[PDB]
Amino acid sequence: MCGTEGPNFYVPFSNKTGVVRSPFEAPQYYLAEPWQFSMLAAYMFLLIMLGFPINFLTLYVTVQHKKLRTPLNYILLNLAVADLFMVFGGFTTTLYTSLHGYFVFGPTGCNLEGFFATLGGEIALWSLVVLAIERYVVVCKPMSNFRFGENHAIMGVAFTWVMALACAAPPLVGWSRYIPEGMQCSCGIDYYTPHEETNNESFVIYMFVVHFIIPLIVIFFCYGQLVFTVKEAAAQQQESATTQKAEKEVTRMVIIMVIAFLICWLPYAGVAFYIFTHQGSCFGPIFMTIPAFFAKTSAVYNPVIYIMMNKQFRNCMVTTLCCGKN
Numbered sequence: 001m002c003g004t005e006g007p008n009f010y011v012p013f014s015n016k017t018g019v020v021r022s023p024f025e026a027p028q029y030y031l032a033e034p035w036q037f038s039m040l041a042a043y044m045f046l047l048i049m050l051g052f053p054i055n056f057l058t059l060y061v062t063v064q065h066k067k068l069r070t071p072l073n074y075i076l077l078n079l080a081v082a083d084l085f086m087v088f089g090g091f092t093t094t095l096y097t098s099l100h101g102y103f104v105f106g107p108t109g110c111n112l113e114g115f116f117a118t119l120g121g122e123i124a125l126w127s128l129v130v131l132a133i134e135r136y137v138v139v140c141k142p143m144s145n146f147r148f149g150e151n152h153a154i155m156g157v158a159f160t161w162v163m164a165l166a167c168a169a170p171p172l173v174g175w176s177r178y179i180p181e182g183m184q185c186s187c188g189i190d191y192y193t194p195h196e197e198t199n200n201e202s203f204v205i206y207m208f209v210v211h212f213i214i215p216l217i218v219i220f221f222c223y224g225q226l227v228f229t230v231k232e233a234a235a236q237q238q239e240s241a242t243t244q245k246a247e248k249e250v251t252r253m254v255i256i257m258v259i260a261f262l263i264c265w266l267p268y269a270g271v272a273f274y275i276f277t278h279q280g281s282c283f284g285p286i287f288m289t290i291p292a293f294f295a296k297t298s299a300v301y302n303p304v305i306y307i308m309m310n311k312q313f314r315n316c317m318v319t320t321l322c323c324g325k326n
């Protein structure tokens with residue numbers, strides 16, 4: 001008796017005192033104090049205020065700077081758009097519901113806000129995967145006579161939308177479901193409930209393997225094989241000081257990317273390990289929602305790492321911000 005079940009929701013609080021209400025109808029202040037809902041709102045405001053300009057400025061400077069519109073950069077524009085789906089489909093909605101203390105848009109808004117928030121983060125995820133595959137193909141040259149062009153870059157972008165739809169869409173048609181999560185102001189995939197009518201179990205396994213394990217293996221193989229290729233080539237040109245400098249910065253950048261991906265990936269595995277073991281107990285409105293809580297920040301630090309630290313974009317954006325000068 002950990003929570004209160006209802007049609008289209010699961011509140012992580014016991015109704016033995018009769019105070020639980022539908023997360024679609026009334027504030028959930030038994031889950032958390034009003035000021036904690038405010039701090040949830042303040043966190044969404046921070047994400048909006050950092051995440052909109054950075055990701056929008058990424059799209060804007062690409063319009064103003066011809067050098068950025070290369071095919072290898074398409075997937076980074078895709079990342080920028082995905083983060084904007086997170087900012088507007090997710091963070092902005094959640095700022096609004098947060099300040100009511102429940103999901104005021106009803107179950108219909110739940111499927112909508114759950115779709116677009118989930119799609120956004122899933123496109124971002126697979127953009128980091130596709131970018132690693134592309135960099136691996138361009139550097140390690142696994143295919144004999146191959147040249148990466150506009151057509152290949154478009155396939156990569158389309159591929160992320162297919163993978164994101166492969167996660168975000170089934171809950172609208174009967175495999176898993178969208179429900180309010182945590183403090184009941186955002187909607188998402190149901191990992192909290194063994195809903196047999198929508199076969200929640202097999203979807204969690206499908207998510208764990210296809211949308212969690214596979215991304216880690218591809219990112220690690222590709223980038224590891226790339227660092228290996230760059231390090232062997234540098235080893236054969238050791239008197240080229242710039243080749244050595246270029247080798248160090250590629251390695252340093254792969255480490256930053258992979259570490260930043262683990263900062264978002266390991267919390268889910270940490271919580272996962274707390275459900276493989278420690279299966280019996282109940283989970284508060286914060287337990288499985290801690291990884292989701294902190295993964296939202298990827299809408300800010302991913303463009304900082306992949307776009308803002310890109311030597312090209314950085315100078316482009318400085319010129320754009322500075323009305324053309326410097």
Ligand SMILES: *[C@@H]1O[C@H](CO)[C@@H](O[C@@H]2O[C@H](CO)[C@@H](O[C@@H]3O[C@H](CO[C@H]4O[C@H](CO)[C@@H](O)[C@H](O)[C@@H]4O)[C@@H](O)[C@H](O[C@H]4O[C@H](CO)[C@@H](O)[C@H](O)[C@@H]4O)[C@@H]3O)[C@H](O)[C@H]2NC(C)=O)[C@H](O)[C@H]1NC(C)=O
Nearest residue numbers: 004005006007009011014015016017018019020021022023
């Ligand atoms: C967590 O647990 C609580 C406690 O059980 C649930 O809240 C109760 O929900 C039931 C309905 O499911 C509520 O019952 C309905 O109350 C209506 C209003 O009652 C108030 O006003 C009357 C005077 O009209 C007072 O006497 C009473 O004390 C209340 O203050 C009634 O109009 C309803 O009557 C209709 O339905 C019943 C059958 O349930 C019939 O017998 C009647 O003839 C009539 O058709 C009904 O009684 C109850 O008031 C709620 N209690 C509280 C404390 O809120 C939550 O739903 C549950 N949470 C979740 C998420 O499930």
Ligand SMILES: O=C1N=C(CC(=O)N2CCC3(CC2)Oc2ccccc2O3)CC=C1Cl
Nearest residue numbers: 125204207208211212215264265268269272
């Ligand atoms: O790679 C990633 N994939 C992500 C996709 C996603 O939203 N998640 C759904 C919940 C998920 C997988 C992760 O976490 C689980 C823990 C235990 C059992 C099943 C699980 O499914 C997010 C972030 C990264 Cl870094």
Ligand SMILES: CCCCCCCCO[C@@H]1O[C@H](CO)[C@@H](O)[C@H](O)[C@H]1O
Nearest residue numbers: 029030031032033034035036037039
């Ligand atoms: C830098 C560390 C920040 C920690 C913030 C913890 C704030 C706790 O603050 C307390 O929380 C209670 C919760 O109901 C309130 O009722 C108390 O009035 C309040 O003082």
Ligand SMILES: CCCCCCCCO[C@@H]1O[C@H](CO)[C@@H](O)[C@H](O)[C@H]1O
Nearest residue numbers: 026027095096097098099100101102
């Ligand atoms: C840009 C941010 C807009 C925030 C809009 C918050 C509106 C909150 O609305 C409030 O919700 C309460 C229920 O929790 C009602 O009881 C109040 O009457 C109502 O004013």
Ligand SMILES: CCCCCCCCO[C@@H]1O[C@H](CO)[C@@H](O)[C@H](O)[C@H]1O
Nearest residue numbers: 181182183184185186286289292293
């Ligand atoms: C150190 C602070 C950790 C705070 C963890 C808070 C977990 C609350 O859960 C949160 O509820 C929100 C409302 O539905 C959701 O939109 C968020 O995705 C979810 O993480």
Ligand SMILES: CCCCCCCCO[C@@H]1O[C@H](CO)[C@@H](O)[C@H](O)[C@H]1O
Nearest residue numbers: 117118121125188189264292295298
């Ligand atoms: C480094 C990887 C970048 C992308 C990380 C995506 C994390 C997505 O996080 C997911 O967001 C959904 C919608 O808010 C929630 O329903 C899920 O509970 C949550 O895990």
Ligand SMILES: CCCCCCCCO[C@@H]1O[C@H](CO)[C@@H](O)[C@H](O)[C@H]1O
Nearest residue numbers: 219220221223224227251254255258
């Ligand atoms: C996804 C896999 C990421 C691969 C990161 C490789 C980091 C290797 O890092 C390198 O290791 C060398 C070991 O001799 C050290 O000598 C170098 O100083 C160091 O740059």
Ligand SMILES: *C(=O)CCCCCCCCCCCCCCC
Nearest residue numbers: 317318319320321322323325326
């Ligand atoms: C040229 O490259 C710079 C052009 C002039 C920009 C100077 C203004 C920058 C201010 C940005 C930070 C504002 C902080 C607001 C915080 C709420």
